[PDB]
Amino acid sequence: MEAVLNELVSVEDLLKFEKKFQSEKAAGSVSKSTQFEEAWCLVRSKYNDDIRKGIVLLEELLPKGSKEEQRDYVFYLAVGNYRLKEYEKALKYVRGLLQTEPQNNQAKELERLIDKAMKKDGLLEVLFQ
Structure with a gap:
């Protein structure tokens, strides 16, 4: 997915x-x-x-929502909150999903992203002090 093509479609x-x-x-x-x-x-x-x-x-x-619908709602509530940098809210949503489906690999990966951002893993200013 060329990025400019992705925007276009x-x-x-x-x-x-x-x-x-x-x-x-x-x-x-x-x-x-x-x-x-x-x-x-x-x-x-x-x-x-x-x-x-x-x-x-x-x-x-x-x-x-049905159970099946709620899975998607909660996933995107975690995504949305993540993009707003509302990490505590995002983590609560994704942890709720992982309660229902502990081996959901997508939810596990999202929780990792939220956690890392929360902890400022890969903050660059630290590397130059």
């Missing part, structure tokens, strides 16, 4: 989804699925306000 996908979302909203029916896909987009944003909106949407969905 992401926009094409966004416009197609926007079309679908606006059509659904106009019809009076924004489903749990489409709301999740909205959140999935938002937590990938370069803008913090977008990520926070995605978190709000996922927290709203969380109590209404």
Whole structure:
């Protein structure tokens, strides 16, 4: 995934989804699925306000989800909080997921990323003192 290509296709996908979302909203029916896909987009944003909106949407969905749905909601709540540098919140979400699925390799890897960031592992200023 060439990075500039990735940005390009992401926009094409966004416009197609926007079309679908606006059509659904106009019809009076924004489903749990489409709301999740909205959140999935938002937590990938370069803008913090977008990520926070995605978190709000996922927290709203969380109590209404099946076990299977909640797995995805909690994963992306951990991701979203991680990207906002809300590490304590991110760790609580991912540790909850690992309670349900201790051998989820993706959740294990995310917990490692959060932990490392929290502890400032690979902070560079230390290397130059």
